[PDB]
Paper text:
SOX proteins are a family of transcription factors (TFs) that play critical functions in sex determination, neurogenesis, and chondrocyte differentiation, as well as cardiac, vascular, and lymphatic development. There are 20 SOX family members in humans, each sharing a 79-residue L-shaped high mobility group (HMG)-box domain that is responsible for DNA binding. The L-shaped HMG-box comprises three α-helices: α1 and α2 that form one arm of the L (major wing), and α3 that forms the other arm of the L (minor wing). Here, we show that all SOX family members, except group H, interact with RNA.
Due to its inability to bind RNA, we sought to characterise the structure of the SOX30 HMG-box domain. Crystals formed in 0.1 M sodium acetate, 2 M ammonium sulphate, pH 4.6, and diffracted to 1.4 Å resolution. Superimposing our SOX30 HMG-box domain structure on other available SOX protein HMG-box domain structures (alone and DNA-bound) demonstrated a very similar secondary structure between SOX family members, with a low RMSD. The C-terminal end of the SOX30 structure is seen to be orientated in a different direction to the other SOX structures. The seven amino acids at the C-terminal end of the HMG-box that we identified as critical for RNA binding (407-QPRPGKR-413; 73–79 HMG-box numbering) are not visible in the SOX30 structure. Structurally, the HMG-box domain of SOX30 retained all of the key features of other SOX proteins, with no obvious structural differences that would indicate why SOX30 does not bind RNA. Conversely, SOX30 has the sequence RPGKR, and thus has lost 40% of its positive charge within this cluster, which may contribute to the loss of RNA binding ability.
Numbering used by the authors: 335 to 405
Amino acid sequence: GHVKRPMNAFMVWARIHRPALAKANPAANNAEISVQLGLEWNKLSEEQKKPYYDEAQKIKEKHREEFPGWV
């Protein structure tokens, strides 16, 4: 609804990068770290974002293995 396809790719990128960013900027709280992750994500080129979108799609497909109709 409010969530669009970029968010799932961004969340892959964030899961990878948040822990080290939090430790490197430990005076910042989680909400501020989240803002910094979003700015870093938006500086990536379309080509750089591609593998995160590709991985988000693989994750989606793996989730759909739970559904009736898988195999």
